[PDB]
Design a binder for this molecule. Structure first.
Ligand SMILES: COc1ccccc1CNC(=N)c1nn(-c2cccc(C)c2)nc1N
Ligand SMILES: O=C(O)CN(CCN(CC(=O)O)CC(=O)O)CC(=O)O
Length: 387
């Protein structure tokens, strides 16, 4: 029977959505390291994911087939998952904003994103999600056309199809959904490419520094030095130290290149052994002046890629799960002449949306390493409090 597989899966998902996200909250709370403000919103997301696994899913199973209830009451069952959805779109929105305010402006952050302003941002969304989510209950419903005073609750017969498309989807979801991927797919892409270039330069001058020490004639030296001077110049304009004022950075490269030129001058003059002797100085010159920034830059990007990629995946799946259900509501509203999407497809669109509140923990398990071994960290944190 298909109906059992539905309720079987519906309950199965509800279990994971609860257990998965509840684990996140323990790690976010038990583990001290995972207590960064960015996880404050991770909790708001997991809290909404928990509410979906507890209340939303049962509410869905019931309205799946309809039921007799008041119009002012049945809107809760049908339009409660709406609040949890907008809350998610608000939580992801914050994490996307919290991560951007730290990638492009790592300076004015700890004075810009305090623990208190964050706590207020979350509540203002839930009360605004309750407002956006439970909007049809203010007096925008189709329960006009059971017992005395009760109306047949079936969603599409109660929820205005123009509220799910124009407002909920377009304004409250589609706008924010596109807003986040377009930014972090670029940040993840620009960073992805930028990190690759920075390494090819560090490796090309690190490699060509060796070809000079073990070189035969003056040609090999003149050619490597040229390739080195290319990498240094490329790296020079590629590693801005955030923050021309107070930059002991442009001086660094100009000390390095200054010796590459003296070396090319040596090689060009046919002084190979004398030119390769200056190559060892370059190692010392690289380690002394430039090595500091090469590493500092390669680290900042490894965080941009891992964070944008992570946040992109979270938002990526969130948009990949909630779109089919919104696409149907669009193909249904803009083409009333089209046959309404079949239940077997409608059901499949509802079931998928419930999964988004399950992947988040899995994503964190496949991405956040701290959250991963956080159990062994909680244990050790307790056994240590014994001597
Ligand atoms: C017959 O199909 C079902 C299967 C399981 C449970 C309920 C139903 C009835 N459909 C619905 N309640 C239903 N929700 N939608 C919906 C669309 C976007 C966002 C949110 C939160 C909800 N869009 C709908 N059509
Ligand atoms: O989801 C993200 O934005 C990426 N992580 C960054 C990675 N995390 C986990 C880790 O790699 O240790 C850093 C952290 O929590 O210490 C943000 C966050 O920490 O909340």
């Amino acid at each position: 029977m298909g109906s059992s597989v539905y309720i079987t899966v519906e309950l199965a998902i509800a279990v994971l959505a609860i257990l998965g996200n509840v684990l996140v909250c323990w790690a976010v709370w038990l583990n001290s390291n995972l207590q960064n403000v960015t996880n404050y919103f991770v909790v708001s997301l997991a809290a909404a994911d928990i509410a979906v696994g507890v209340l939303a899913i049962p509410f869905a199973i019931t309205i799946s087939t309809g039921f007799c209830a008041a119009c002012h009451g049945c809107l809760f069952i049908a339009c409660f998952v709406l609040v949890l959805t907008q809350s998610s779109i608000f939580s992801l929105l914050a994490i996307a904003i919290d991560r951007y305010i730290a990638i492009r402006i790592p300076l004015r952050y700890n004075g810009l994103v305090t623990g208190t302003r964050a706590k207020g941002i979350i509540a203002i969304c839930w009360v605004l999600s309750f407002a956006i989510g439970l909007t049809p209950m203010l007096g925008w419903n189709n329960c006009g056309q059971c017992g005395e005073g009760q109306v047949a609750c079936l969603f599409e017969d109660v929820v205005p199809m123009n509220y799910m498309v124009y407002f909920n989807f377009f304004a409250c979801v589609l706008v924010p959904l596109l807003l986040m991927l377009g930014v972090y797919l670029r940040i993840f892409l620009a960073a992805r490419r930028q990190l690759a270039d920075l390494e090819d330069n560090w490796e090309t001058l690190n490699d060509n520094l060796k070809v000079i020490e073990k070189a035969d004639n003056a040609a090999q030296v003149k050619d490597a030095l040229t390739k080195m001077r290319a990498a240094a110049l490329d790296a020079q304009k590629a590693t801005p130290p955030k923050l021309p004022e107070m930059k002991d950075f442009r001086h660094g490269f100009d000390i390095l290149v200054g010796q590459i030129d003296d070396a090319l001058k040596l090689a060009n003059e046919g002084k190979v052994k004398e030119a390769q002797a200056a190559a060892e100085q370059l190692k010392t010159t690289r380690n002394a002046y430039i090595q500091k920034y090469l590493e500092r830059a390669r680290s900042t990007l490894q965080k941009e890629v891992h964070a944008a990629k992570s946040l992109a995946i979270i938002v990526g799946l969130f948009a990949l799960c909630w779109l089919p259900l919104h696409i149907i509501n669009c193909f249904t509203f803009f083409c009333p002449d089209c046959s309404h999407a079949p239940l077997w497809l409608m059901y499949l669109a509802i079931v998928l949306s419930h999964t988004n509140s399950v992947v988040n923990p899995f994503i964190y398990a496949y991405r956040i390493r701290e959250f991963r071994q956080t159990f062994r960290k909680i244990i050790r944190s307790h056994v240590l409090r014994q001597q």
